[PDB]
């Protein structure tokens, strides 16, 4: 697909908009403030922080070269949650649902 | 008890207020804004350090025991609503231990 601005517009207008409205999206809509949340080893374990608020402004302001770079940021966001937290944590169940929905919608590019 | 209440404000409350664990307790739990529909059903007497601060600043307490009771209500509310091992319970237990260390030195 050559028109990579169009696939990125789809990721913003369809994919991200759908995920943003999900009831479990809110924990991933702002950066993790590890000091305020008392997560003392978060930035030591997570070396590439990522959140949907950052992805959104990057899509709105033409940061990405192509759709796969944006998809890469989504996957980093999900994996960060899986790495730092334990399996079965409430936030991990929320991340798994968003990722399943995310992978469901990128099939339709 | 002007002197004991002055101590509760300038030493006890201020010490907790400056701790980095103070922020969840510095304003009331707005269960509507926070999407906590069950909060007011479980917690019937909400209390926070912001409310305690305004009551001390406006001389709404008649004695120290009234003020101490509000602190304990705040801590118990957190223990009741959350589970042992929750992050916020660790913060509340540390703040309460700190609170008890300063209540030992309350004047007479």
């Amino acid at each position: 697909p050559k028109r990579q601005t169009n696939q990125l517009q789809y990721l913003l207008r369809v994919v991200l908009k759908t995920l943003w409205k999900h009831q479990f999206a809110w924990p991933f809509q702002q950066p993790v403030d590890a000091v305020k949340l008392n997560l003392p080893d978060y930035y030591k374990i997570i070396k590439t922080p990522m959140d949907m608020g950052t992805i959104k402004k990057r899509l709105e302001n033409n940061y990405y070269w192509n759709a796969q770079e944006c998809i890469q940021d989504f996957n980093t966001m999900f994996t960060n949650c899986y790495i730092y937290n334990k399996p079965g944590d409430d936030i991990v169940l929320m991340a798994e649902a968003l990722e399943k929905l995310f992978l469901q919608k990128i099939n339709e590019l | 008890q002007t002197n004991q209440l002055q101590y509760l404000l300038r030493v006890v409350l201020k010490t907790l207020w400056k701790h980095q664990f103070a922020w969840p307790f510095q304003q009331p739990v707005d269960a509507v804004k926070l999407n906590l529909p069950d909060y007011y059903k479980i917690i019937k007497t909400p209390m926070d350090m912001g409310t305690i601060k305004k009551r001390l600043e406006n001389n709404y307490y008649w004695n120290a025991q009234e003020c101490i009771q509000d602190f304990n209500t705040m801590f118990t509310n957190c223990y009741i609503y959350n589970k042992p091992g929750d992050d916020i319970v660790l913060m509340a237990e540390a703040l309460e231990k700190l609170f008890l260390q300063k209540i030992n030195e309350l004047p007479t």
């Binding site: 924990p27 305020k36 | 804004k33 906590l36």
Partner: peptide
């Protein structure tokens, strides 16, 4: 959805 409100919610989730 932001600032203290988001942080509080975030804290209670753990």
């Amino acid at each position: 959805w932001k600032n203290w409100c988001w942080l509080k919610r975030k804290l209670l989730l753990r």
